[PDB]
Amino acid sequence: MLLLTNHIGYETQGPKQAVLLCGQTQLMDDCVLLVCARSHQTVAKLAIEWHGKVDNWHQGQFHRIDFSDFTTPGDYYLRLEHTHSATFTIARGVLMQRTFSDVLHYFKSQRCSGQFDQQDKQVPLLSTSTTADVHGGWYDASGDVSKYLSHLSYANYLNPQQTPLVVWNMLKGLAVLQHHSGFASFSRTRLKDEALFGADFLRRMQNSEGFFYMTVFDKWSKDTKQREICAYATQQGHKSDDYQAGFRQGGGMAIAALAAAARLDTHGEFTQADYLQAAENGYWHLKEHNLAYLNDGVENIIDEYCALLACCELYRTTENDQYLAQAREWAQRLAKRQCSDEQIAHYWSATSNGERPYFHASDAGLPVIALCEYLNIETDTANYAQLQRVVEQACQFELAITQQVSNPFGYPRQYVKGVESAKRTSFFIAQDNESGYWWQGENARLASLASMAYLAQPHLSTAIAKPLEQWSQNALNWIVGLNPYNMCMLDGHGHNNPDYLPHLGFFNAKGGVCNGITAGFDDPRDIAFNPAGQKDDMLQNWRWGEQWIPHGAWYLLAIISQFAHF
Amino acid sequence: MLLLTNHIGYETQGPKQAVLLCGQTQLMDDCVLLVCARSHQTVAKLAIEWHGKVDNWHQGQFHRIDFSDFTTPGDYYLRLEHTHSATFTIARGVLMQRTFSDVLHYFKSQRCSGQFDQQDKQVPLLSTSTTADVHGGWYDASGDVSKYLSHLSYANYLNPQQTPLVVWNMLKGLAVLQHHSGFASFSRTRLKDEALFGADFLRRMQNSEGFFYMTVFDKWSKDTKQREICAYATQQGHKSDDYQAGFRQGGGMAIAALAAAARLDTHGEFTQADYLQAAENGYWHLKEHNLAYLNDGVENIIDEYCALLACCELYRTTENDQYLAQAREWAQRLAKRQCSDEQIAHYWSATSNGERPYFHASDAGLPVIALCEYLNIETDTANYAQLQRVVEQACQFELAITQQVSNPFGYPRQYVKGVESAKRTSFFIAQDNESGYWWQGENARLASLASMAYLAQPHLSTAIAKPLEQWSQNALNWIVGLNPYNMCMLDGHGHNNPDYLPHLGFFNAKGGVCNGITAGFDDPRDIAFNPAGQKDDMLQNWRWGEQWIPHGAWYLLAIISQFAHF
């Protein structure tokens, strides 16, 4: 008997729900009390909405309690007979003004420093006798002082955007809140400071030929002397000299950041001109050699969304028609990844035939986000209205799929497929993917989708506005404690914050978001977080408790997009 | 009915208590239940110890509940009829392994950066047309991006040690936990990284002539262009060109850090030789010109404790007898500050006549700490046994004074005197001091004293060991929520964390410790934290909610000393 809630709070003018975890499909009393937390007096009577089993999640039976129409600010909790929820807050831009500072502190806490950053001034390029100066940037995870543009390059369909995404997300934040007087001056300064710190690093990560180094990998040794520019593969981190980052391999996103970084009135250790050049150069180089840098030699959706962003950002900065033309092409290419099949319409396909769907535990939003950046700069109304309808259909999909089974928690669902298994709709990603091993929590994904929904509202019918308000909130709610494990994954907030590997001195950091909750280790249709079986297996326990900078970066853009939307 | 507890936990083999806040002097039933938090079954029956009123603290009536003899690890809470305490933990080195990481993250979060640090490369020296490169170090407070060796130099008896203390505390931490296998290798790396970052800054803060710059002050403007090397006075921060830091003005401590920094196998942006030189040079320069740099031209206790440390650290590093001789002199001088008067024995005197006692809301420990560093290096057994007895008597004092009135909370008491009041024993400092305005929370002071107790045990009888174990714990307990305001002052831990000025974007940072609780604003014998009267007055609300790097630094040394002691 648990009343699961957002451990932080709900928007005054926003969707609000909770979820009841119990034993039965119905109870005697069908009502829940919203109670003022100071006065302990009831302030609303709430109807329970029955549901029960969810996929095959062990914990028990789950039900929904909506209290959206309630719009009076303050602190409340839910009560149900004996049991009552944790206190939460209803206010305007609650998440933003509560967490934003701490998330940014996290980033500043995880800046590459000391021994490691000294060494990163003279880093071996694998297989050569060359060095590069690639100091700066952020350590990637609670237990990894390696620094990434991307990894899992070898699986092809999995490449997550890492250090670049951080930078671009931050710049994109500054963008939406420039002119917003409710965003404090010091708070704007802090976001520039961090963003430009990142930009500098991205600029340093570009080899003179025009490509960007993909990884600075230490094989998880925490050895200074093992820090090498490379790629790697498998869970044993076999290093390889394919360190050229293609569009999907984090290069596309690195261009987009540096182009946006160029538009700031201030700059970092490098000038605005320095950034823009590195962007333009880096783009036309990949326009030539992308395919040579792709492990399977075929561009997929990830390349398409990444490159579109790069072009959209370069046009904005330079106003040079070439880039609008390139955007237009990439957009048309991306719109082609919109596929319908015999059991679901307008899903995103990785492959061009529609045989393997797109699904991502990190950047799942970007398809729609990237199209929205295009729509923002596309003045020809034929092109606009075409790709407008793509964005509309893709959002209709996200809603359709997520509401096609019993889903009290509102957890965004997705179309997945394993290397050797059938296309199926799912809560979590296919564990049996091309990596051979890789799967973890999706907090990044959730916040990515949340961000997508908020940023798309400009280009969407007001028919589908309110539904996405809910979808996006339900995603965020999960991250901060409206989940079966009654666990806030944002550290230093809510309850039951998970740590990673304290006994080895690899702690989580306050303000960071951890990987999060996954499908069952043994049972794809169950749910798992640090399950007893594998909780102590250091080969597996990374999947849940460990923090990873994309989770934070997407959370940061989500809360800012949310703040802007109210 | 509140059962106040440590919001984190108690040592398995450590003193444990709670405090009952209620209405009455006695209750009907006189017993409290220690309850297992997982099984909800009783595990001990605890006697209440009656007390009632404390000084003139408004909240109500206070009683003690001791449960020290209970030594079974796990999670428990106290229950008393309907009401129960917050869950807490009993384990070995509980505070250290719970917080250490986060406190260090805080420091890395508060490193001087961005536009501010760029500007700190070319800082005007007030009244001249000179520049100094003083980039690095940590921002001083939640709402101050100025960087300090010390301030309140003008009041003479108030100078707190700031940036140097951080560095020295950290180095001193590394020292006690070198060889300690329970301190993770990565965790040692992080502490060096941060310490050496600090050392570099202290090295940069030394003008070539041999003195150190006292402050890098921006008049709280958060303006880049207002950053000037200077001193200042009053609450309006009137800048002045007396920027030479004497022994008490943070110079003594800066020497001590750089000397200890020289002993590390690794080094920062400057070499071990660079640090040692800056130390030796800086010392012999102050040995000459100290008096010229003191606002009132007279050395007081603060100079004596600061300089002793410097000498003790320089002897350890160089093994050059000159410094042991200097230590020996400073020690003899400091022992002279031990005074008895007609109502209290072996208090610390600021002035040489004993007319104004020493009391400090920051570094109150150092007298005894500095003598202990001397005792650590003093081989002549006459000198040792003399100053041994001083350290013994000074601790007997701290215990005597703190147990002379109804004191359920165990809050270390102190001998104070104002500009406008008689010598009196007190909980908090004299608000009516030489600053003209300055008084705040004493969390630094508490942790300073805790640290003192742990580090002194080597040189103390086992007769007075257990009492100081309790005193030190009772200090720490207060910081993390065993206080009338049921408030953990360590951010990201316990309950009711206070923020500072979020509406202006001057947030507290997770891992930091804030100023804390004070005497009543209107009533010296009451207690205050963000009281309604002054809570919104921005001229006064700094006194409570604001974070300040000494609180953190002393907390960090306390938890480390504690960890070492069990």
Author numbering:
A (entry chain A), B (entry chain D): 1 to 566
Show sentences the authors wrote.
Based on sequence homology, VC0615 was assigned to glycoside hydrolase family 9 (GH9) of the Carbohydrate-Active enZymes (CAZy) classification scheme, a family primarily associated with endoglucanases (‘cellulases’). In 2008, a large-scale assessment of chitin-utilization pathways in the Vibrionaceae suggested that VC0615 was in fact a exo-acting glucosaminidase, the substrate of which was the GlcN-GlcN-O6-P disaccharide resulting from the import of chitobiose (GlcN)2 through a phosphotransferase-transport system. In contrast, a substantial amount of starting material remained in the cellobiose digest after 1 h (both reactions were initiated with 10 mg ml−1 substrate). These experiments demonstrate that VC0615 is a substantially more effective exo-glucos­aminidase than exo-glucosidase, which is in line with previous observations on PBPRA0520 and the lack of cellulose metabolism shown by Vibrionaceae in general. VC0615 forms part of an exo-acting glucosidase/glucos­aminidase subgroup within the CAZy GH9 family, alongside previously reported structures of PRPBA0520 and VP2484.
Here, we report the structure solution of the V. cholerae enzyme VC0615, which was solved at 3.17 Å resolution with poor-quality data reflecting crystal lattice disorder. The best molecular-replacement solution from Phaser indicated the correct space group to be P3221, with five molecules of VC0615 in the asymmetric unit. The VC0615 crystal structure contains two relatively well ordered homodimers of VC0615 in each asymmetric unit (chains A and D and chains B and C in our structure), as well as a fifth highly disordered molecule of VC0615 (chain E) which appears to lack a dimeric partner. Difficulty in packing molecules of ‘chain F’ within the VC0615 crystal lattice provides a clear explanation for the high degree of disorder observed in molecules of chain E, and may also be a substantial contributing factor to the poor diffraction quality of VC0615 crystals in general. Calculated interface areas were 1294.9 Å2 per molecule for the A–D dimer and 1289.6 Å2 per molecule for the B–C dimer. Given the essentially identical calculated interface areas between the A–D and B–C dimers, as well as their strong similarity (r.m.s.d. of 0.32 Å over 1129 residues as calculated by SSM superposition in CCP4mg), this arrangement of VC0615 is likely to be the biologically relevant dimer present in solution. VC0615 protomers are comprised of two domains: an N-terminal fibronectin type III (Fn3) domain (amino acids 1–92) and a C-terminal (α/α)6-barrel domain (93–566) which contains the active site.
